[PDB]
Amino acid sequence: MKRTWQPNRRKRAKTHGFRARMRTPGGRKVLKRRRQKGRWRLTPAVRK
Amino acid sequence: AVKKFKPYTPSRRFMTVADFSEITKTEPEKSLVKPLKKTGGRNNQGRITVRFRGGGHKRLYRIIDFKRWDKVGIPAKVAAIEYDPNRSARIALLHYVDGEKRYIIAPDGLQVGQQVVAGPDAPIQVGNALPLRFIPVGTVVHAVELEPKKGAKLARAAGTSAQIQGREGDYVILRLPSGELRKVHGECYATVGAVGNADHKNIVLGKAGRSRWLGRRPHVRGAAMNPVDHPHGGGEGRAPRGRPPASPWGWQTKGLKTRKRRKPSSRFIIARRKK
RNA sequence: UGGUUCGUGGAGCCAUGGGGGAAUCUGGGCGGACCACCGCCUAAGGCUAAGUACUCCGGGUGACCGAUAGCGCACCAGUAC
RNA sequence: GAGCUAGCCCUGGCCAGGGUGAAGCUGGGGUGAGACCCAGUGGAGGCCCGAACCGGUGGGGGAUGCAAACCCCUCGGAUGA
RNA sequence: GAAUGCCGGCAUGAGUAACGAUAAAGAGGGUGAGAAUCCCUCUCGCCGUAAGCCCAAGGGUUCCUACGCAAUGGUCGUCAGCGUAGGGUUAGGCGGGACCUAAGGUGAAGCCGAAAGGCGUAGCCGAAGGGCAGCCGGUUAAUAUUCCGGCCCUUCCCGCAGGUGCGAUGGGGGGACGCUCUAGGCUAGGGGGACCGGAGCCAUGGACGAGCCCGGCCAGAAGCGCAGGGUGGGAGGUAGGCAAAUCCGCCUCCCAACAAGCUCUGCGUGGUGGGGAAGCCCGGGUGACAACCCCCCGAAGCCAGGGAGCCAAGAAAAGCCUCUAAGCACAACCUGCGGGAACCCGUACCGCAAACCGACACAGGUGGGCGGGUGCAAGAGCACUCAGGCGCGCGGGAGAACCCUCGCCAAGGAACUCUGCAAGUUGGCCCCGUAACUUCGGGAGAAGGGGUGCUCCCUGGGGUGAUGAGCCCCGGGGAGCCGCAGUGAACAGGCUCUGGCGACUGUUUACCAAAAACACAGCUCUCUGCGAACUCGUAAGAGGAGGUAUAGGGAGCGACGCUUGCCCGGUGCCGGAAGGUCAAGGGGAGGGGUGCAAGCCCCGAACCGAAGCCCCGGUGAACGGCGGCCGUAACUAUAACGGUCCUAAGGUAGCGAAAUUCCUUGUCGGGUAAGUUCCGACCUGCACGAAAAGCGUAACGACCGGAGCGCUGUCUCGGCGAGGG
RNA sequence: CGAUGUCGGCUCGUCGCAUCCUGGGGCUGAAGAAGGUCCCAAGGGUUGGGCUGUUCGCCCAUUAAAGCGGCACGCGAGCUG
RNA sequence: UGGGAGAGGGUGGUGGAAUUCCCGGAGUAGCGGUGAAAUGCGCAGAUACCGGGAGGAACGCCGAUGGCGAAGGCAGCCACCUGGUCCACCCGUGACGCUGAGGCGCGAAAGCGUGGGGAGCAAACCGGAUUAGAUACCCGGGUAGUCCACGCCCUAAACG
RNA sequence: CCGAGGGUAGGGCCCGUGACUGGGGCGAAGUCGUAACAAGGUAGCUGUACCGGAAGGUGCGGCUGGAU
Ligand SMILES: [Mg+2]
Ligand SMILES: [Mg+2]
Ligand SMILES: [Mg+2]
Ligand SMILES: [Mg+2]
Ligand SMILES: [Mg+2]
Ligand SMILES: [Mg+2]
Ligand SMILES: [Mg+2]
Ligand SMILES: [Mg+2]
Ligand SMILES: [Mg+2]
Ligand SMILES: [Mg+2]
Ligand SMILES: [Mg+2]
Ligand SMILES: [Mg+2]
Ligand SMILES: [Mg+2]
Ligand SMILES: [Mg+2]
Ligand SMILES: [Mg+2]
Ligand SMILES: [Mg+2]
Ligand SMILES: [Mg+2]
Ligand SMILES: [Mg+2]
Ligand SMILES: [Mg+2]
Ligand SMILES: [Mg+2]
Ligand SMILES: [Mg+2]
Ligand SMILES: [Mg+2]
Ligand SMILES: [Mg+2]
Ligand SMILES: [Mg+2]
Ligand SMILES: [Mg+2]
Ligand SMILES: [Mg+2]
Ligand SMILES: [Mg+2]
Ligand SMILES: [Mg+2]
Ligand SMILES: [Mg+2]
Ligand SMILES: [Mg+2]
Ligand SMILES: [Mg+2]
Ligand SMILES: [Mg+2]
Ligand SMILES: [Mg+2]
Ligand SMILES: [Mg+2]
Ligand SMILES: [Mg+2]
Ligand SMILES: [Mg+2]
Ligand SMILES: [Mg+2]
Ligand SMILES: [Mg+2]
Ligand SMILES: [Mg+2]
Ligand SMILES: [Mg+2]
Ligand SMILES: [Mg+2]
Ligand SMILES: [Mg+2]
Ligand SMILES: [Mg+2]
Ligand SMILES: [Mg+2]
Ligand SMILES: [Mg+2]
Ligand SMILES: [Mg+2]
Ligand SMILES: [Mg+2]
Ligand SMILES: [Mg+2]
Ligand SMILES: [Mg+2]
Ligand SMILES: [Mg+2]
Ligand SMILES: [Mg+2]
Ligand SMILES: [Mg+2]
Ligand SMILES: [Mg+2]
Ligand SMILES: [Mg+2]
Ligand SMILES: [Mg+2]
Ligand SMILES: [Mg+2]
Ligand SMILES: [Mg+2]
Ligand SMILES: [Mg+2]
Ligand SMILES: [Mg+2]
Ligand SMILES: [Mg+2]
Ligand SMILES: [Mg+2]
Ligand SMILES: [Mg+2]
Ligand SMILES: [Mg+2]
Ligand SMILES: [Mg+2]
Ligand SMILES: [Mg+2]
Ligand SMILES: [Mg+2]
Ligand SMILES: [Mg+2]
Ligand SMILES: [Mg+2]
Ligand SMILES: [Mg+2]
Ligand SMILES: [Mg+2]
Ligand SMILES: [Mg+2]
Ligand SMILES: [Mg+2]
Ligand SMILES: [Mg+2]
Ligand SMILES: [Mg+2]
Ligand SMILES: [Mg+2]
Ligand SMILES: [Mg+2]
Ligand SMILES: [Mg+2]
Ligand SMILES: [Mg+2]
Ligand SMILES: [Mg+2]
Ligand SMILES: [Mg+2]
Ligand SMILES: [Mg+2]
Ligand SMILES: [Mg+2]
Ligand SMILES: [Mg+2]
Ligand SMILES: [Mg+2]
Ligand SMILES: [Mg+2]
Ligand SMILES: [Mg+2]
Ligand SMILES: [Mg+2]
Ligand SMILES: [Mg+2]
Ligand SMILES: [Mg+2]
Ligand SMILES: [Mg+2]
Ligand SMILES: [Mg+2]
Ligand SMILES: [Mg+2]
Ligand SMILES: [Mg+2]
Ligand SMILES: [Mg+2]
Ligand SMILES: [Mg+2]
Ligand SMILES: [Mg+2]
Ligand SMILES: [Mg+2]
Ligand SMILES: [Mg+2]
Ligand SMILES: [Mg+2]
Ligand SMILES: [Mg+2]
Ligand SMILES: [Mg+2]
Ligand SMILES: [Mg+2]
Ligand SMILES: [Mg+2]
Ligand SMILES: [Mg+2]
Ligand SMILES: [Mg+2]
Ligand SMILES: [Mg+2]
Ligand SMILES: [Mg+2]
Ligand SMILES: [Mg+2]
Ligand SMILES: [Mg+2]
Ligand SMILES: [Mg+2]
Ligand SMILES: [Mg+2]
Ligand SMILES: [Mg+2]
Ligand SMILES: [Mg+2]
Ligand SMILES: [Mg+2]
Ligand SMILES: [Mg+2]
Ligand SMILES: [Mg+2]
Ligand SMILES: [Mg+2]
Ligand SMILES: [Mg+2]
Ligand SMILES: [Mg+2]
Ligand SMILES: [Mg+2]
Ligand SMILES: [Mg+2]
Ligand SMILES: [Mg+2]
Ligand SMILES: [Mg+2]
Ligand SMILES: [Mg+2]
Ligand SMILES: [Mg+2]
Ligand SMILES: [Mg+2]
Ligand SMILES: [Mg+2]
Ligand SMILES: [Mg+2]
Ligand SMILES: [Mg+2]
Ligand SMILES: [Mg+2]
Ligand SMILES: [Mg+2]
Ligand SMILES: [Mg+2]
Ligand SMILES: [Mg+2]
Ligand SMILES: [Mg+2]
Ligand SMILES: [Mg+2]
Ligand SMILES: [Mg+2]
Ligand SMILES: [Mg+2]
Ligand SMILES: [Mg+2]
Ligand SMILES: [Mg+2]
Ligand SMILES: [Mg+2]
Ligand SMILES: [Mg+2]
Ligand SMILES: [Mg+2]
Ligand SMILES: [Mg+2]
Ligand SMILES: [Mg+2]
Ligand SMILES: [Mg+2]
Ligand SMILES: [Mg+2]
Ligand SMILES: [Mg+2]
Ligand SMILES: [Mg+2]
Ligand SMILES: [Mg+2]
Ligand SMILES: [Mg+2]
Ligand SMILES: [Mg+2]
Ligand SMILES: [Mg+2]
Ligand SMILES: [Mg+2]
Ligand SMILES: [Mg+2]
Ligand SMILES: [Mg+2]
Ligand SMILES: [Mg+2]
Ligand SMILES: [Mg+2]
Ligand SMILES: [Mg+2]
Ligand SMILES: [Mg+2]
Ligand SMILES: [Mg+2]
Ligand SMILES: [Mg+2]
Ligand SMILES: [Mg+2]
Ligand SMILES: [Mg+2]
Ligand SMILES: [Mg+2]
Ligand SMILES: [Mg+2]
Ligand SMILES: [Mg+2]
Ligand SMILES: [Mg+2]
Ligand SMILES: [Mg+2]
Ligand SMILES: [Mg+2]
Ligand SMILES: [Mg+2]
Ligand SMILES: [Mg+2]
Ligand SMILES: [Mg+2]
Ligand SMILES: [Mg+2]
Ligand SMILES: [Mg+2]
Ligand SMILES: [Mg+2]
Ligand SMILES: [Mg+2]
Ligand SMILES: [Mg+2]
Ligand SMILES: [Mg+2]
Ligand SMILES: [Mg+2]
Ligand SMILES: [Mg+2]
Ligand SMILES: [Mg+2]
Ligand SMILES: [Mg+2]
Ligand SMILES: [Mg+2]
Ligand SMILES: [Mg+2]
Ligand SMILES: [Mg+2]
Ligand SMILES: [Mg+2]
Ligand SMILES: [Mg+2]
Ligand SMILES: [Mg+2]
Ligand SMILES: [Mg+2]
Ligand SMILES: [Mg+2]
Ligand SMILES: [Mg+2]
Ligand SMILES: [Mg+2]
Ligand SMILES: [Mg+2]
Ligand SMILES: [Mg+2]
Ligand SMILES: [Mg+2]
Ligand SMILES: [Mg+2]
Ligand SMILES: [Mg+2]
Ligand SMILES: [Mg+2]
Ligand SMILES: [Mg+2]
Ligand SMILES: [Mg+2]
Ligand SMILES: [Mg+2]
Ligand SMILES: [Mg+2]
Ligand SMILES: [Mg+2]
Ligand SMILES: [Mg+2]
Ligand SMILES: [Mg+2]
Ligand SMILES: [Mg+2]
Ligand SMILES: [Mg+2]
Ligand SMILES: [Mg+2]
Ligand SMILES: [Mg+2]
Ligand SMILES: [Mg+2]
Ligand SMILES: [Mg+2]
Ligand SMILES: [Mg+2]
Ligand SMILES: [Mg+2]
Ligand SMILES: [Mg+2]
Ligand SMILES: [Mg+2]
Ligand SMILES: [Mg+2]
Ligand SMILES: [Mg+2]
Ligand SMILES: [Mg+2]
Ligand SMILES: [Mg+2]
Ligand SMILES: [Mg+2]
Ligand SMILES: [Mg+2]
Ligand SMILES: [Mg+2]
Ligand SMILES: [Mg+2]
Ligand SMILES: [Mg+2]
Ligand SMILES: [Mg+2]
Ligand SMILES: [Mg+2]
Ligand SMILES: [Mg+2]
Ligand SMILES: [Mg+2]
Ligand SMILES: [Mg+2]
Ligand SMILES: [Mg+2]
Ligand SMILES: [Mg+2]
Ligand SMILES: [Mg+2]
Ligand SMILES: [Mg+2]
Ligand SMILES: [Mg+2]
Ligand SMILES: [Mg+2]
Ligand SMILES: [Mg+2]
Ligand SMILES: [Mg+2]
Ligand SMILES: [Mg+2]
Ligand SMILES: [Mg+2]
Ligand SMILES: [Mg+2]
Ligand SMILES: [Mg+2]
Ligand SMILES: [Mg+2]
Ligand SMILES: [Mg+2]
Ligand SMILES: [Mg+2]
Ligand SMILES: [Mg+2]
Ligand SMILES: [Mg+2]
Ligand SMILES: [Mg+2]
Ligand SMILES: [Mg+2]
Ligand SMILES: [Mg+2]
Ligand SMILES: [Mg+2]
Ligand SMILES: [Mg+2]
Ligand SMILES: [Mg+2]
Ligand SMILES: [Mg+2]
Ligand SMILES: [Mg+2]
Ligand SMILES: [Mg+2]
Ligand SMILES: [Mg+2]
Ligand SMILES: [Mg+2]
Ligand SMILES: [Mg+2]
Ligand SMILES: [Mg+2]
Ligand SMILES: [Mg+2]
Ligand SMILES: [Mg+2]
Ligand SMILES: [Mg+2]
Ligand SMILES: [Mg+2]
Ligand SMILES: [Mg+2]
């Protein structure tokens, strides 16, 4: 049947993207935390 | 007159439709329509604030002239009478000798080809508009302003009207559609005659589908819900109300008056509505 | 109403959201209701090192660990997944 | 977190074929004029039968499955909320 | 040594289950260390509204070639979507951007919020919508509307020539719109040809034939032709389209008007460029100087912004045209022609799937287009089959029980069982014929029955032609032939009688309930006079509504028919300027601390002092409620009648052992040989009853009861057979 | 209670005997035939249907007879539900 | 052809008295009702009086034993539209007539449907009396309805 | 071919009968009240409508076949 992951690149970038996170207080705290942890990727990589 | 159908479906047995007999033109003036942004009953937060709205037929909004004292002394010809999906009354397209075209709401008995005009000097005939000072006591009227130059507010739906009952100083006394008696400022404009399409209220939708065409989604009784949802919710099997009948938000709904008491307009309302 | 040890208590002191509303030393605040006496102090402008805190970083040293321990990672780890 | 799901909003798309034959219209009849009746025309409808499409009625199978809801047979809607 | 402890390792179950659709395989030849599994050939089967082809998501080198087989592959492997390496994606015209706007998002001005932030007209961003210039063919191992070939086209810059009051982010036009149905003429696509081109074939009894088999086109500027779309012209006045206007709108006049004319698209033609089958021969040659023509069918596509009807009344903005404003009128713009200029990103491959979502090379899920032929009434249904693609990544045997899916069955025919659960029966089309009841639509495909193939002969109307033949479509009548059987295979209702509940089509517990539940038109109560009530938000701001009492909110009830009684003492709601109670505050009689004092400070009586409550009324489609006992009539029985306690008042009409009845399988009647169920009655209703509506009601229901006919392996009662295990 | 699945039906039995029938007996208010009552006896047998989920029971038509109990109210890693 | 009388019918308008309600004023201890009473209403200011407003229905006098119509039935006043009928002239037509089974139309009140309107009155209903009792007669309240439009119903002591 | 009739199926009319139910007639020796005939103690009768144990009542409109 139809499952939960229906990939959509524009949706991905617009929802979890770098400019999405930076627009908002909680989104920058995500970036601060992910940078503090040493994550190689601060944000999901969608091909574009 | 309203039009019936033969019972060739279970819904056509009861469906009735407006005959549309006064309508002389089936397309709207392109310069007077604009898109009507459908809300679905949702507000600027995205939240439902009026339940069970949405899904109706697409509509363009006809720009109506609810001021009329714009063009004192300038006569206009009644060029057409049109359907308006945004209101129960019909609309009439006016052709001012100015060259300017405007929509008013069509009074009862308005004739295409006749002339109307607005102003303190207008004759007391259907379609003309005057400040209330100059309309004779007893004449029935519509598209009444509430305050001067703020636009027609009262008696706007199909078949409705108000009656001038007398004068008192700077104000005239109107019997509003609801039966209320109200002072209204004499400089407020009005339009002589009743609103047209008085058969509007004899329409029988006939089927659930018809309501849906109009943007009315199904209504859910509180008694069919659960206690999380509604005061009337829950109960094992069916259940009487078991408390004073209440809205989804807990307030009582059988008689509880809700007009604010200290409202400044009370100094102008003589007698609360009848019936 | 808050702060203080003070939770309405005899409840002062310091702060102030509302109302009323002064004086310039013979002016004014405080000494735990309040009054007198006796003292202390100078509100409604601002600044000021040092002694104090912390440990991303550098070093020194362990009756600290020794690869299931010690940091999640001694190794290409905030990786693979 | 509404890329699942629920509702709404904007903008596009889809619905083989067959059946029934409403109003209206034209003609004829009728009448003082009408109502109305008959025929032809017509093509209405949360109309009918049935694929796509949307479903999930009863049974059987499956049950460390092909599958964390599937398969076969049957069955509901299919111009409409 | 134990914590169903934690991490790791290794056992048991066990050579067991399984190896992922029952579309299916066999042989020969090759390669190789090794072959059921790789390559090649022949034979067989399966899909063909797909299991074929194209496009968009998503995936991201999986594409091509060489060399490999440790692992990955449910076996094997020499093979591969795997390992290594090299190569491969070419655009002014295709898609997106240097254009437009939609919801929405953002957001100068502005507004609001302790902070963070929330809003917000314009503007901007935002597409699969508007707009915009490329078709056919060839070529690579792998790209092609991109390279090449032929023929076309767009914008920008500059110049030349003619022309004009030129000029805009401003004004106006236009862009610009629904659903259903549909005309004319075309194109796509298809069928036939005794005609045109073609390598060949004559088998096994016959045929050298009007034989078989194969193919008989594609693109194309201007011009022309056919078919459609769009659009009236002139003058005069003008106060409106936030300036101006010659434009547009309005009034008037005059010609024109279903015409023509001007313009635009489609189709045909068209210089020109291409393609080109079967067979044969080792993807390529040949066929071939290939031929390339006539007839019929015909779109849901095209002309298109076509036409009609209908109510639920159907985006925006830019491009485009027109008007004028500053300005500028050696400029500028318009038209023609010529040269130059023309950027960025995508393009491989998979794409109903082994490359996407499902941990898997997973019987599941995935939006748009093409989707041939014949026959069956039609069709995208069904059977077979074309092009194209496959035989589903374990096999070989055997022929037990049992299981699964399937076929048949003597006599009986529901006796099975909770229940005909399941499975039979019925089954399309044409004709005949069809009941109660009914809201006059229906019920209805009611029920029930007859016909159905092929052959010859006669014949009627239509379509295309031309009026004819030919082709295609719809029929009619007569006489015959064969079989058990003619929708001869496949796809295709079993029917009726009678209750309950719900009017109806719809909706629901994604994944145990589809229903009598929710919704529904419709009924009533109630609130709301507009800066509405009400909802969201601290607010600003929104929704309501660019609506205005024939409207909007809340509640119950639930088509329709006939109806909806009595109780306002309690609670609710509504009304009541009296009265009672009533907090802060006002007031300050009187009292207290302290001071030598004037004075400072504290307590405090009467009285004044809101809403609310109390109090007085009203109100039931507001919350709710709606009795008991004794007695009485020519036999008994019962009680129309009287008496009496209690209550706010004591259940009306209608219905009743009921979706409600405990006693209960109540009693009586019907149906059955026999009926705890069913239907009809009665009424001592444990414990119906009138909008948590009462009683009915045609039609409707994958709802739940009861009965009958038809027919059956459900059964007496079992047997045999098939295929996958 | 870190789980001992439940009524009824179907299937499959096996056992007890306080015996329903068949076999053997005593008594009889046993003439015969038919019965009554008690004793011995468990080898075998103990039907098909209507109602109801029912066990049970009632009823129909038969029968030599239409027995009663136990086995986790026998039997759901055997089925039904 | 020329005249007449008339509440004959339909549509649109419009006038005054009275009843009730609301507002203002003034005023106070009762009003109302009956055979007599009580319920009811009234110091929360009634009744009685004056001024203002709203609204519905019916039209006093004229009015008669009268007029009109086929019947039912028709009553303020104005206008429009329209029927029947009588009279005088004796002008035209030339028996064109009478009746009338079926048909069609009309048809008081009550009742029905959809919508409006609602002052007064008033079935049902509630209360007070009366009475042996009183589901009545009398009194205080009161919903349909009574009124308007359109569609039904089609009855009568529709009687002379 | 037709064809007595038989068979399957569906309709129409008539008769008998049926748990139970509606009223009607008669009986009369009962219970309740007294609706009509007199102004019958509320003049009566009436079509209709709503209501009540019963006769009946009330509303609306009509008749006199109504006493004074
Ligand atoms: Mg997942
Ligand atoms: Mg999706
Ligand atoms: Mg993905
Ligand atoms: Mg995307
Ligand atoms: Mg996208
Ligand atoms: Mg998206
Ligand atoms: Mg982003
Ligand atoms: Mg990571
Ligand atoms: Mg890195
Ligand atoms: Mg992130
Ligand atoms: Mg009309
Ligand atoms: Mg109708
Ligand atoms: Mg109709
Ligand atoms: Mg009709
Ligand atoms: Mg119906
Ligand atoms: Mg109509
Ligand atoms: Mg109209
Ligand atoms: Mg339109
Ligand atoms: Mg526009
Ligand atoms: Mg709008
Ligand atoms: Mg809006
Ligand atoms: Mg917004
Ligand atoms: Mg938001
Ligand atoms: Mg949000
Ligand atoms: Mg709401
Ligand atoms: Mg809504
Ligand atoms: Mg309208
Ligand atoms: Mg209308
Ligand atoms: Mg209605
Ligand atoms: Mg609508
Ligand atoms: Mg609604
Ligand atoms: Mg509802
Ligand atoms: Mg519920
Ligand atoms: Mg919740
Ligand atoms: Mg709660
Ligand atoms: Mg609650
Ligand atoms: Mg409740
Ligand atoms: Mg409930
Ligand atoms: Mg309850
Ligand atoms: Mg419930
Ligand atoms: Mg209950
Ligand atoms: Mg409930
Ligand atoms: Mg319910
Ligand atoms: Mg309850
Ligand atoms: Mg209730
Ligand atoms: Mg309650
Ligand atoms: Mg106001
Ligand atoms: Mg203390
Ligand atoms: Mg303190
Ligand atoms: Mg302060
Ligand atoms: Mg001092
Ligand atoms: Mg001092
Ligand atoms: Mg101080
Ligand atoms: Mg101090
Ligand atoms: Mg001290
Ligand atoms: Mg000090
Ligand atoms: Mg220092
Ligand atoms: Mg320091
Ligand atoms: Mg150590
Ligand atoms: Mg060490
Ligand atoms: Mg280690
Ligand atoms: Mg470690
Ligand atoms: Mg480290
Ligand atoms: Mg480690
Ligand atoms: Mg690593
Ligand atoms: Mg759209
Ligand atoms: Mg369809
Ligand atoms: Mg027809
Ligand atoms: Mg028509
Ligand atoms: Mg349908
Ligand atoms: Mg249909
Ligand atoms: Mg259908
Ligand atoms: Mg769906
Ligand atoms: Mg199913
Ligand atoms: Mg089945
Ligand atoms: Mg089966
Ligand atoms: Mg199963
Ligand atoms: Mg499972
Ligand atoms: Mg399946
Ligand atoms: Mg299936
Ligand atoms: Mg089916
Ligand atoms: Mg269907
Ligand atoms: Mg269809
Ligand atoms: Mg439908
Ligand atoms: Mg729709
Ligand atoms: Mg131990
Ligand atoms: Mg374990
Ligand atoms: Mg264990
Ligand atoms: Mg462990
Ligand atoms: Mg462990
Ligand atoms: Mg092992
Ligand atoms: Mg073995
Ligand atoms: Mg084993
Ligand atoms: Mg398998
Ligand atoms: Mg091999
Ligand atoms: Mg090998
Ligand atoms: Mg091969
Ligand atoms: Mg991937
Ligand atoms: Mg490639
Ligand atoms: Mg590769
Ligand atoms: Mg390998
Ligand atoms: Mg190997
Ligand atoms: Mg290997
Ligand atoms: Mg492997
Ligand atoms: Mg595998
Ligand atoms: Mg090799
Ligand atoms: Mg592979
Ligand atoms: Mg290479
Ligand atoms: Mg090119
Ligand atoms: Mg550029
Ligand atoms: Mg833009
Ligand atoms: Mg675009
Ligand atoms: Mg393009
Ligand atoms: Mg081209
Ligand atoms: Mg290539
Ligand atoms: Mg438009
Ligand atoms: Mg559009
Ligand atoms: Mg539609
Ligand atoms: Mg056509
Ligand atoms: Mg072509
Ligand atoms: Mg064809
Ligand atoms: Mg031969
Ligand atoms: Mg043509
Ligand atoms: Mg002008
Ligand atoms: Mg062409
Ligand atoms: Mg060739
Ligand atoms: Mg050649
Ligand atoms: Mg040659
Ligand atoms: Mg040749
Ligand atoms: Mg079509
Ligand atoms: Mg059109
Ligand atoms: Mg409408
Ligand atoms: Mg816009
Ligand atoms: Mg200038
Ligand atoms: Mg020009
Ligand atoms: Mg650039
Ligand atoms: Mg690029
Ligand atoms: Mg490419
Ligand atoms: Mg699929
Ligand atoms: Mg596979
Ligand atoms: Mg798959
Ligand atoms: Mg094709
Ligand atoms: Mg067929
Ligand atoms: Mg067919
Ligand atoms: Mg099919
Ligand atoms: Mg074929
Ligand atoms: Mg296979
Ligand atoms: Mg074997
Ligand atoms: Mg199979
Ligand atoms: Mg058999
Ligand atoms: Mg049978
Ligand atoms: Mg039989
Ligand atoms: Mg049954
Ligand atoms: Mg069958
Ligand atoms: Mg069949
Ligand atoms: Mg029948
Ligand atoms: Mg009928
Ligand atoms: Mg129907
Ligand atoms: Mg039937
Ligand atoms: Mg044959
Ligand atoms: Mg056969
Ligand atoms: Mg088949
Ligand atoms: Mg069928
Ligand atoms: Mg059956
Ligand atoms: Mg039936
Ligand atoms: Mg029912
Ligand atoms: Mg239903
Ligand atoms: Mg239901
Ligand atoms: Mg109903
Ligand atoms: Mg309903
Ligand atoms: Mg329904
Ligand atoms: Mg449907
Ligand atoms: Mg479920
Ligand atoms: Mg569930
Ligand atoms: Mg779940
Ligand atoms: Mg669930
Ligand atoms: Mg299920
Ligand atoms: Mg369910
Ligand atoms: Mg269903
Ligand atoms: Mg539900
Ligand atoms: Mg419901
Ligand atoms: Mg109703
Ligand atoms: Mg709130
Ligand atoms: Mg706002
Ligand atoms: Mg708004
Ligand atoms: Mg708005
Ligand atoms: Mg509104
Ligand atoms: Mg409902
Ligand atoms: Mg009926
Ligand atoms: Mg009663
Ligand atoms: Mg009460
Ligand atoms: Mg009360
Ligand atoms: Mg009371
Ligand atoms: Mg209560
Ligand atoms: Mg004092
Ligand atoms: Mg003292
Ligand atoms: Mg009521
Ligand atoms: Mg109570
Ligand atoms: Mg209630
Ligand atoms: Mg007695
Ligand atoms: Mg009762
Ligand atoms: Mg009973
Ligand atoms: Mg019974
Ligand atoms: Mg019942
Ligand atoms: Mg009960
Ligand atoms: Mg009980
Ligand atoms: Mg019972
Ligand atoms: Mg019982
Ligand atoms: Mg019984
Ligand atoms: Mg039963
Ligand atoms: Mg039952
Ligand atoms: Mg009884
Ligand atoms: Mg309820
Ligand atoms: Mg109920
Ligand atoms: Mg249903
Ligand atoms: Mg159903
Ligand atoms: Mg049968
Ligand atoms: Mg069997
Ligand atoms: Mg066999
Ligand atoms: Mg077998
Ligand atoms: Mg086999
Ligand atoms: Mg076998
Ligand atoms: Mg336990
Ligand atoms: Mg355990
Ligand atoms: Mg366990
Ligand atoms: Mg004897
Ligand atoms: Mg013995
Ligand atoms: Mg024995
Ligand atoms: Mg034994
Ligand atoms: Mg039994
Ligand atoms: Mg029993
Ligand atoms: Mg018994
Ligand atoms: Mg015997
Ligand atoms: Mg036992
Ligand atoms: Mg026991
Ligand atoms: Mg027991
Ligand atoms: Mg047991
Ligand atoms: Mg058991
Ligand atoms: Mg089990
Ligand atoms: Mg069991
Ligand atoms: Mg077990
Ligand atoms: Mg066990
Ligand atoms: Mg069972
Ligand atoms: Mg169960
Ligand atoms: Mg007083
Ligand atoms: Mg008189
Ligand atoms: Mg004469
Ligand atoms: Mg009448
Ligand atoms: Mg009447
Ligand atoms: Mg009234
Ligand atoms: Mg009534
Ligand atoms: Mg009524
Ligand atoms: Mg009436
Ligand atoms: Mg008379
Ligand atoms: Mg015979
Ligand atoms: Mg015979
Ligand atoms: Mg009397
Ligand atoms: Mg009497
Ligand atoms: Mg009398
Ligand atoms: Mg009664
Ligand atoms: Mg009584
Ligand atoms: Mg009475
Ligand atoms: Mg009369
Ligand atoms: Mg008399």
Residue numbers in the entry:
A (entry chain 17): 1 to 48
B (entry chain 1D): 2 to 276
Mind quoting what the paper says about this structure?
Many of currently used antibiotics inhibit protein synthesis in pathogenic microorganisms by targeting their 70S ribosomes, which are complex macromolecular machines responsible for this process. The catalytic peptidyl transferase center (PTC) located at the heart of the large ribosomal subunit (50S in bacteria) polymerizes amino acids into polypeptides in the order specified by the nucleotide sequences of the translated mRNAs. Newly-made proteins emerge from the ribosome through the nascent peptide exit tunnel (NPET) that spans the body of the large ribosomal subunit beginning at the PTC and ending on the opposite side of the large ribosomal subunit facing the cytoplasm. Here, we discover that well-known ribosomal antibiotics, hygromycin A (HygA) and macrolides, which target peptidyl transferase center and peptide exit tunnel, respectively, can act cooperatively against susceptible and drug-resistant bacteria.
